């Protein structure tokens, strides 16, 4: 789901999209823990998880 994930990212803000790029290793190839990602954003593991959930839900519909 490289194209579909991309269409989803287009609907998120810069910040949310980059959370997901980091998470899924879309740029450097390496997936990252919710904790690495949370540290990069200065937010909790849970907030990163909610962003990921929002994206998966968007990924399912269209």
């Amino acid at each position: 789901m490289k194209e579909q994930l991309e269409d989803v990212l287009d609907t998120l803000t810069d910040r949310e999209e980059n959370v997901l790029r980091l998470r899924f290793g879309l740029d450097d190839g390496r997936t990252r823990t919710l904790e690495e990602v949370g540290k990069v954003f200065g937010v909790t593991r849970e907030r990163i998880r909610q962003i990921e959930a929002k994206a998966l839900r968007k990924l399912r519909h269209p």
């Binding site: 450097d28 190839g29 823990t33 690495e36 200065g42 593991r45």
Partner: protein, 198 residues
């Protein structure tokens, strides 16, 4: 705040304005992003009350302060050297901090947005920053394991590499925080470069 790079030369920017309303600004120049676009993950732009300016807003984050805005104080937010007049695409505060970030990236052997680059060199930059992240994750657990040197290391060591890394990161020093902040802004820069060079 959503910046879309349409091609090497042209972007659009969509920002919250008021109520439920967003505004989309077209003909956004890609050339100068360093001078305006905040690289910090703790901030984003909103449209000013009158539509002439893009004004900074602090998100809810533990990341360091940038652009002289510690939290949302409209003395600084509304001030001319802290915002970006639309179509002028210059924000002195943002530019100043962006530039520190740039010099740091240059020091780490990463390509930078103010000098020439192409897709290959950006890709190499993402390779190298990935290496930095990984090494960092090794150092973080190393340092946590010293602290925190109790013979209960066995308890920690009952976890997987990921749970260990997670607990160490959770509990780390402010210094480590600063390293991750820096790297996050550099990552944002490399992504702007990737997108421009597509």
């Amino acid at each position: 705040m959503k910046l879309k790079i349409l091609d090497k030369d042209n972007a659009t920017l969509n920002v919250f304005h008021r109520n439920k309303e967003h505004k989309t600004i077209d003909n956004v120049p890609t050339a100068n992003l360093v001078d305006w676009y905040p690289l910090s993950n703790a901030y984003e732009y909103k449209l000013s009350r009158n539509g002439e300016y893009l004004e900074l807003k602090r998100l809810r984050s533990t990341l360091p302060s940038s652009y002289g805005l510690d939290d949302n104080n409209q003395d600084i937010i509304r001030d001319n050297n802290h915002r970006c007049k639309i179509g002028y695409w210059y924000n002195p505060a943002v530019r100043k901090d962006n530039l520190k970030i740039i010099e740091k990236a240059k020091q780490y052997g990463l390509p930078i947005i103010t000098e020439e680059y192409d897709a290959n060199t950006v890709e190499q930059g993402f390779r190298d920053i990935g290496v930095i992240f990984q090494s960092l994750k090794t150092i973080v657990v190393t340092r946590y394991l010293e602290g925190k040197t109790e013979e209960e290391l066995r308890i920690f060591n009952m976890k997987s590499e990921e749970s260990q890394l997670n607990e160490a990161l959770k509990e780390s020093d402010f210094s480590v925080d600063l390293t991750y902040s820096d790297l996050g802004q550099i990552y944002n820069m490399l992504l702007l470069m990737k997108k421009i060079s597509k």
